């Protein structure tokens, strides 16, 4: 629902506000923040967060996100990049489509699934998996590497 009354409004008239008579509601009974984790809170850490207390891995003091950013597509989705009206033309037509993945912000092609239509296609990208290359060549298509 888009709106509902709160619990606090029902607790008017009941002594302890739902915190108990014996236990009460004190200020900080367990400590502040995420502290105590090697000591009295060891059971919470070993159950939910086992890889917290450690150092790991190779270090580079400065990294650049733009130099490493990439996005991946599978062969089964190649025909899907075209508009539905465009798909329905190339399905019947005698011509071969020329699809450039760079134009949709994809740089690497993966070998997942089968091609939607079993007719030739030209695919342009920066990198192909070994499975992807074999699948495209199977239908008489061509893989073109480009920057």
């Amino acid at each position: 629902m888009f709106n509902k009354k709160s619990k606090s409004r029902k607790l008017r008239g009941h002594v302890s506000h739902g915190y108990g008579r014996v236990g009460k509601h004190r200020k900080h009974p367990a400590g502040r923040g995420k502290s105590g984790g090697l000591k009295h809170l060891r059971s919470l850490f070993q159950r939910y967060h086992p890889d917290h207390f450690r150092k790991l891995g190779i270090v580079m003091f400065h990294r650049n996100k733009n130099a490493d950013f990439t996005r991946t597509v599978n062969v089964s989705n190649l025909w899907g990049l075209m508009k539905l009206e465009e798909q329905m033309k190339f399905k019947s037509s005698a011509e071969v489509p020329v699809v450039d993945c760079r134009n949709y912000g994809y740089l690497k092609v993966l070998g997942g699934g089968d091609l939607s239509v079993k007719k030739p296609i030209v695919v342009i990208a920066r990198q192909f998996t070994k499975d992807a290359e074999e699948k495209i060549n199977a239908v008489g298509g061509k893989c073109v590497v480009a920057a």
């Binding site: 367990a30 923040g33 995420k34 809170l41 919470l44 939910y48 967060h49 917290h52 650049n64 733009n66 130099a67 950013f69 075209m82 465009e86 190339f90 037509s93 005698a94 011509e95 071969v96 489509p97 020329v98 699809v99 450039d100 760079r102 134009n103 949709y104 030739p120 030209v122 342009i124 061509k142 073109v144 920057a147």
Partner: protein, 164 residues
């Protein structure tokens, strides 16, 4: 601390921290509008904004996209037959720090200069323009678009010879 959560990390410990609210947003927008309007009267026939070059964006992530830059280089201006003092008088921006390193980048910026020169119109006095009822251009001049292109088709014999 109890139950399963992503471990906290909220940075509100520092008692000297300042808060910035934005209740002034609609009013400051209205002031910026009114300053542009009055500035536009002071130079009535002329556009409020200068002409700027087209450059290519920086990293591997943005190579395939073109953008506006700061100013034309002394070489671009000279190649289109103008001199630096004249270019300023006609509302072209200048940047003497930039260098040219490609044939393509130079050729495109020369086209912009020649196009702009051709679309201009000159007047002796302000009153002449006023009497002709000239309406002054607003916004940026000849901005790039960077649309997504369209899927080209090719005949099976071509596939062996060109590769898209």
């Amino acid at each position: 601390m109890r139950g399963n959560q992503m471990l906290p990390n909220n940075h509100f410990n520092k008692g000297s921290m300042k808060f910035k609210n934005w209740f002034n947003q609609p009013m400051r927008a209205l002031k910026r509008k009114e300053v542009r309007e009055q500035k536009s009267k002071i130079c009535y026939p002329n556009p409020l904004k200068k002409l700027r070059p087209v450059v290519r964006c920086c990293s591997m992530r943005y190579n395939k996209k073109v953008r506006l830059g700061r100013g034309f280089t002394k070489m671009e201006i000279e190649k289109a037959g103008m001199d630096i003092k004249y270019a300023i008088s006609v509302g072209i921006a200048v940047d003497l720090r930039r260098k040219n390193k490609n044939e393509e980048g130079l050729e495109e910026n020369v086209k912009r200069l020649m196009d702009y020169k051709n679309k201009l119109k000159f007047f002796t006095t302000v009153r002449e323009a006023r009497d002709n009822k000239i309406e002054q251009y607003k916004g940026e001049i000849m901005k790039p678009v960077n649309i997504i292109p369209e899927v080209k088709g090719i005949k099976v014999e071509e596939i062996a010879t060109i590769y898209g």
